[PDB]
Amino acid sequence: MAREENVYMAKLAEQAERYEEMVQFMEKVSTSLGSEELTVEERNLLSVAYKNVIGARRASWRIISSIEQKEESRGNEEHVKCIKEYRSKIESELSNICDGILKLLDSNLIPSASNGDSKVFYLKMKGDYHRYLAEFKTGAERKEAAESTLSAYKAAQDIANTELAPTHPIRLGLALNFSVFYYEILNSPDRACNLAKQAFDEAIAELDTLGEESYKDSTLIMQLLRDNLTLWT
């Protein structure tokens, strides 16, 4: 039995936009390996699955936080009691989604990675989910989220800057997320700007020496760095 039926189902889940189910499908593939690693196709699907499941909660959290602020500032105390209870239900889901993909990165995807690209990808992804904890967690939990994000992004960068070109979308993607961590979570606009510019310039420097479909892949991310650089200046 090769259940790459589980891969096909995840692809249908994706088409259907039923992302919780896309997660289950790609989780079944993941928890089914012995010594083998997720292919590129498979890890991307897993990551897209989780980005969409977490993304709906993050989008909901943002709108409920705005409404909370707007209402606290009109003294509507009764609204605020309600909005806050709603915000904490979203925070449980955020908290559980992050735990699921963190357990699977700590337990499985990270210890068993082989190539560089893989290691960076998964260490990057661990940083990503500690970052999402830090967007809404409060005290000790926020400090622990922020520390875990810095360690994972840094472990990913040491491996990236050795074992991958400056144009490799995974190296750019790390720089883009790490730049954002510095701006949104640590509140270092300088560190963020410098990190994005450095990885952009370093990628232009060695750009027109890759197959026409590579250019597509990483022009995409490089436009994301430039978009943020514009927004911040």
């Binding site: 991307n44 990551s47 897209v48 980005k51 990503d128 979308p169 993607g173 954002v180 994301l224």
Partner: peptide
């Protein structure tokens, strides 16, 4: 809006 990676 600020952006992050697609993966």
């Amino acid at each position: 809006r600020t952006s992050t990676a697609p993966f």
